[PDB]
């Protein structure tokens with residue numbers, strides 16, 4: 289059958305296409321610029337890309353642009369998201385894009401299910417942290433707007449887009465699933481540095497401005513995540529939002545896993561404002577596992593796959 | 609340094625890119641459709657493609673469409689031509705865009721300020737398409753447009769379109785002081801990197817496939833190895849003594865002589881021993897590459913080499929069966 293994947297040039301999108309191709313789907317991968325060799329080379333190099341992968345130019349800002357790509361699809365995987373005035377440059381596009389792709393799905397008449405990649409930023413952005421988050425939990429928009437932490441506009445954009453999308457999904461018998469990853473970490477097929485690896489390997493690179501997100505962190509392996517995407521597309525019992533997250537630990541525990549694996553790097557021992565009495569916040573993937581889905585990887589796997597791919601590509605120095 | 613290649617998806621263009629990249633050039637490949645996986649995958653998989661290759665969308669039918677790809681280039685290889693489909697409307701679908709697109713690219717080169725030389729791949733169909741065949745052709749010879757239009761033989765519109773484009777190009781070259789070179793290949797034969805069957809291999813391999821619609825082109829045939837041709841393109845771009853037109857052809861023989869060789873190498877195919885309307889006393893017609901070899905260029909490949917490479921590539925890609933019954 290034929291499935292569309294938006295944001296195929298990205299870290300999650302390209303890995304998902306790979307997996308969908310390996311499982312024997314015919315894939316329509318969307319990109320905003322098909323002439324960009326540094327993004328399409330990696331797509332066109334995937335197994336079965338010659339016979340089962342087609343490329344489609346589309347942009348979330350352009351109303352109707354996903355129309356033709358989606359027409360004749362049985363499934364859509366909406367992974368793409370827009371990345372000075374955030375309210376209009378990021379927020380509105382994301383919501384409109386989202387609706388735009390369900391409109392395009394309905395216009396298509398052939399889509400049986402739409403799977404949206406959401407964000408942990410839709411779940412736990414509030415001032416007080418619960419010890420365990422689940423799918424009934426939603427982020428606090430007034431806290432986002434009033435405090436404006438790093439990435440606030442992506443918290444707000446994805447929360448609003450997913451809620452706007454659920455409205456539409458119930459209205460129009462559009463059968464909609466959402467998957468909520470926490471920090472996605474793993475090897476990758478792209479030659480640019482995955483954004484979430486800038487955050488995950490921050491203990492190594494010393495990028496302080498990324499610590500807050502891993503102070504109390506949650507993690508999922510890219511391959512577990514893509515599988516979860518396909519599983520949920522297929523498994524017709526699937527309903528609702530699904531958290532996809534395999535590990536949680538505070539930054540001390542992360543950094544401590546890393547030091548032991550990577551003596552080679554200058555991985556600090558203590559972090560500002562972080563007691564060992566800091567509780568870890570877990571994202572419960574019970575709803576997903578109760579369906580039957582199983583996680584195949586470990587925190588160690590994630591960061592090994594990551595650091596190995598990053599050095600191989602010259603994105604990380606081999607030591608400090 | 610940076611050069612543009614038009615029609616980079618094709619048989620000649622894709623090999624030219626590969627050799628240009630291998631020689632340390634930065635290349636700007638143009639294509640009509642960059643989402644076409646079967647046209648771009650062979651390009652993006654070339655070594656150094658990630659760092660030294662960029663793609664650009666352009667069509668000879670669209671005015672100024674090559675401006676952006678060309679600006680910043682030091683050299684342009686114009687290899688593209690409308691030769692995709694049989695057309696019920698040759699004047700507008702073939703002839704017009706060939707001439708205008710040629711001119712439009714020369715203008716783009718003017719406007720770009722940075723282009724030291726434009727190299728155009730012409731065609732043996734601008735040279736020997738006339739009712740009477742001379743024994744040897746050289747760069748002074750030009751096809752007979754009244755003969756073409758009178759007879760309307762197969763491919764008449766490509767003979768006409770290239771002839772009028774090159775003649776228009778030469779006029780424009782002189783009037784605007786552009787360093788212009790034309791290369792006139794004969795039938796191009798060899799291995800290749802594209803996934804579909806090269807149009808010229810349909811013609812070249814016709815004694816094996818039995819596609820009699822192509823025999824008239826090879827009745828009195830002339831040939832050049834693809835890699836020799838592409839080397840000649842580079843050689844000519846770089847060689848500062850290059851001027852005017854250049855024939856690039858390394859072999860000639862009549863179809864009987866071609867079929868003999870192919871029967872010898874490939875007993876597994878059913879290659880005819882006779883051809884209606886051809887006897888052993890038929891004159892071979894040579895295209896003379898002396899102007900090119902006089903500059904210093906040396907051909908490396910033989911006729912056997914050309915055909916072995918074409919046949920093995922076609923087999924490997926499943927474009928020819930391994931044998932007949």
Ligand SMILES: NC(=O)c1ccc[n+]([C@@H]2O[C@H](COP(=O)([O-])OP(=O)(O)OC[C@H]3O[C@@H](n4cnc5c(N)ncnc54)[C@H](OP(=O)(O)O)[C@@H]3O)[C@@H](O)[C@H]2O)c1
Pocket residue numbers: 294295296297298299300301319320321327346347348349367368369370371405406407408446468469470471472473482483484
């Ligand atoms: N990685 C994580 O830790 C993580 C965690 C939770 C959720 N997510 C979600 O996962 C998705 C994938 O993120 P990722 O980390 O794979 O990011 P990425 O590697 O940065 O990929 C993002 C994709 O978005 C596309 N895109 C950006 N603007 C677009 C536009 N205006 N129209 C169409 N496409 C556009 C980009 O395509 P081009 O640049 O080719 O145009 C790119 O392919 C995002 O929705 C994100 O919110 C990620």
Ligand SMILES: NC(=O)c1ccc[n+]([C@@H]2O[C@H](COP(=O)([O-])OP(=O)(O)OC[C@H]3O[C@@H](n4cnc5c(N)ncnc54)[C@H](OP(=O)(O)O)[C@@H]3O)[C@@H](O)[C@H]2O)c1
Pocket residue numbers: 615616617618619620621638639640641647666667668669687688689690691692705729730731732770792793794795796797806807808
């Ligand atoms: N092959 C030979 O035996 C031989 C002999 C003498 C001369 N030539 C000359 O060599 C050149 C290339 O021939 P080839 O054998 O490589 O043929 P080819 O494989 O068909 O390649 C020609 C290219 O022209 C491009 N094209 C078609 N219409 C176009 C248009 N409207 N705008 C821009 N590009 C267009 C196509 O690229 P896209 O489809 O990506 O856009 C195609 O890749 C031609 O100019 C021909 O006259 C060839």
Ligand SMILES: O=c1c(O)c(-c2cc(O)c(O)c(O)c2)oc2cc(O)cc(O)c12
Pocket residue numbers: 369406407408409410438439442443446483487497498500501
């Ligand atoms: O670069 C960042 C980023 O992209 C996101 C992000 C968060 C989400 O919830 C999303 O849904 C999303 O698409 C992106 O968060 C961040 C949080 C930080 O503390 C620091 C960062 O550098 C980022």
Ligand SMILES: O=c1c(O)c(-c2cc(O)c(O)c(O)c2)oc2cc(O)cc(O)c12
Pocket residue numbers: 407408409410412413469470471483484485486487501505506507
């Ligand atoms: O999309 C992203 C995302 O959701 C989160 C995130 C992870 C968590 O573990 C959370 O608890 C949380 O609230 C947000 O971080 C990110 C960091 C990046 O660099 C880039 C991203 O795209 C995300």
Ligand SMILES: O=c1c(O)c(-c2cc(O)c(O)c(O)c2)oc2cc(O)cc(O)c12
Pocket residue numbers: 689691730731732733734762763766767770807811821822824825
């Ligand atoms: O398919 C053909 C073709 O493409 C050309 C051709 C000839 C030229 O001179 C050109 O300059 C050109 O671009 C194409 O000739 C042909 C001649 C035939 O008898 C039969 C054919 O099938 C072709």
Ligand SMILES: O=c1c(O)c(-c2cc(O)c(O)c(O)c2)oc2cc(O)cc(O)c12
Pocket residue numbers: 730731732733734736737793794795807808809810811825829830831
């Ligand atoms: O471009 C082409 C071309 O020039 C010739 C050609 C070859 C000769 O040897 C001649 O003497 C002649 O007059 C024309 O054939 C071709 C055959 C194809 O199938 C495709 C082509 O593109 C050409």
